[PDB]
Every structure is written in C-alpha cells, then in structure tokens.
Symmetry: D2
Subunit: 115 residues, 4 copies
C-alpha cells in the first residue's frame, strides 16, 4: 500500500469518517485523470487506493471532500475541498501518507514519506 | 481590499517573501478563468489583487507557488503548490484574508473573513 | 513593541477576541516570574505587553487561555491552554509575533521573529 | 494503551524519531508530578506510557523535547519544548492520541480522543 490518506477532525478531536477522497494523475495533455477514490473508514483512514505497479512516477492530486463533511455535521465550512498536489518519484522513500487536519475555516496537510 | 494573502515560513520564522500567487474564478462554463496574480512583499503579504466592484460572487481558487519558494531556498518541497478554493461573497461582500503557513512537507491554510 | 500575540479562531474564521494572555520570565532561581498580561482585541491582537528596555534576554512563557475562550462560546475544548516557551533576544533584540490558530481539539503556534 | 503520543517532522516529512517525551500529573499542591516518559520510536510513536488503572481523571501535561530534536538535526529552533496540557475525564472517549507536527519555528498539536 504505497498511498494512504488520513483525515482528522480538529473540532471534535476524532477521525473524520466517511470523507470522500479522489485521486488523479496528471495526463500528458495536463488534464486530471481519475486514478483512485474511496471514503475514509471509522479510523479516518483510506487504504488500498493503488498498488506498487500502478503507482508510477507522475504528478498526483488528492482531492478531499471537506465541504460535504462539514455540511453533514452542521458546520458552515470555508473551503470547497482540500486539494493536495505532489510529484511521486521513485528515488527516495515511497510509502506516502497524506494526512489532513480539518477545521471549518482552516486545514493543514502533511506528507509522511517513508521507506 | 477585499482579498489579501499572507504567507509565513515555518522553518525560518519569517514572512515568506516573493511567493507567486495566482487567483482564478470559476466561469459560467465551469472552467477556471484567470482573475488576478501577484507576489508576496517583504512582509509576506499580497494586497491589491482586486477591487470591491470586480470581486463579485463566485468560486475562487488561490494558487500559492510554494514549490518555487522552497526550491529557490535549497529545499526539495513535497507539494506542487498550495491551492485554496472557496465560494466568495454569497451572503454579500466580505473581506478575505487567506493565510498560509509553509513547511517543506506540510502547510496549513486559514481564512479570516470579516464584514467590511 | 517587541512582543505581540495574534490569535485566530479556525472554526469561525475570525480573530479570537478577548482571549487572556499571561507572560512569564524564568528567574535566576528557575521559577516563572509574572512578566506581563493582557487580552486580545477585536482584531485578535495583543500589543503593548512590554517595552524594548524591559524585554531583556531570558526564557519567556506565553500562556494563552484557550479553555475560557472555547468554554464561553459553548464548546468543550481539549487543552487547558496553549503555552509557548522560548528564549528571547539572545542574539540581540528582536521583535516577536506569537501567532496561535485555535480549534477545540487542536492548535498551532508560529513565531515570526524580525530584526528591528 | 490509553495514552499514545505521535510526533512528525514537517521539514523532512517523516516520523520524528527519538524525541523525548515526559508526562506529568498535576498534584493537589498544583506542582507537576512526573508520571511517565519515553522516546518516540522509528515510527514517531510512543506507546505504553501508562495503563487504564493508573490513568485516572486529572490534569496531565505532556512535554515534548523539540529543542533537542532540532539541535541534533542542525536546525535552529524557536521553542524550548512543546507542552500539551489537558484534563483526562472518564465520561467520554478515553483512548488519547496526542499528535504533534513539528517545524523549527512552529508546531501544531491535535488530540484524537476515541472509544
């Protein structure tokens, strides 16, 4: 599992559950090709998005549906979504955890890139 | 000044200076149209992107070129950029400050929205 | 104004107003001595805590009463407060902005340190 | 394991390894009683600090030695340490993960409190 996404709710101090996540790969035309998607589990985690074979070097975009999340919970959110865009390269570490910490008007994202 | 961007460097504890910022608006046909652009000043602030008259209701995307920033300082950053996408002015005109706090593998963004 | 504190509310996207802030200095005997205190203004800023003359080298602790803030707004926050502890002025006088971004179960703090 | 501490390095996008962590409980005199301590593992995690029996309601302080961390890595840090102070109460969720995300001049901390 070379790409994992983990989402936390900073208001309630919990996993952000059933958050929709879509992953895209940049195509040679520079448009965004759907690659993978899923919803975060009860632990705020989304595993099994891709495989080592499929997850080649390229520029990837991870779009987190934060607006839908806050809407279901009765909170008026600022952002339409949280976008994370990065280049996956073969030379260094290559398990990627994209972590997102969510508030109605703020989010932070952090990549933990390990062996 | 209804739209302002402030960018801080969390490694140096300083404003993040000369960071390129591009702003787009979603058009009727659902494409991103160029709206404004600029660079942060010595104070890490970017003012004057737009005017009250021009800054109508819409979905806006603020793209902060964090990669060029970190690269020019010798670091090899994780993100291509930091994108902030939001609906603006749909309860009427507001003033928006988009704050970004930058580290090589992490960033946070915050909106401060005030009533003029 | 060598020491300033700015506090933002990440739930409301607004400055965090009327937040109590207490500042202590570590004394020769290793105890925390009261140094200054105040409340954030309508802009979430707290200015005038000290002067250049008074703000000598030392280890300082800035205690932000986030609990009372969230409690008065109906939320039941996780933290008792947000503490920021730092050595000041040991390469000579600097100006310090301590920024805190607040959520009920999370906060981040950032220092912007500039050369007067 | 009702108290877990997890530390990340936002500069390198990795676990913050071998970070010293001390936990204190507030005594009735209002002084801070050493309770538990440890160093973060290779995954940035510190488990086994306490047990359900020992971890009674009270006010706890978790002190993370961030300065030593940055110093060993050649980065000039701002903070003397990162302090997290909270009340542990019996009524709601009670596994606590204290997460810290570290930069030289900034840190964020987040509590994930689950069943």
């Amino acid at each position: 599992c070379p790409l994992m996404v983990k989402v936390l709710d900073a208001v309630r101090g919990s996993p952000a559950i059933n958050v929709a996540v879509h992953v895209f790969r940049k195509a040679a035309d520079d448009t965004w090709e759907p690659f993978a998607s899923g919803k975060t589990s009860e632990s705020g985690e989304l595993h099994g998005l891709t495989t080592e074979e499929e997850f080649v070097e390229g520029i990837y975009k991870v779009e987190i549906d934060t607006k839908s999340y806050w809407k279901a919970l009765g909170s008026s959110p600022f952002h339409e979504h949280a976008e994370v865009v990065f280049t996956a390269n073969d030379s260094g570490p290559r398990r990627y955890t994209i972590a997102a910490l969510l508030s109605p008007y703020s989010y932070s994202t952090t990549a933990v890139v390990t062996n």
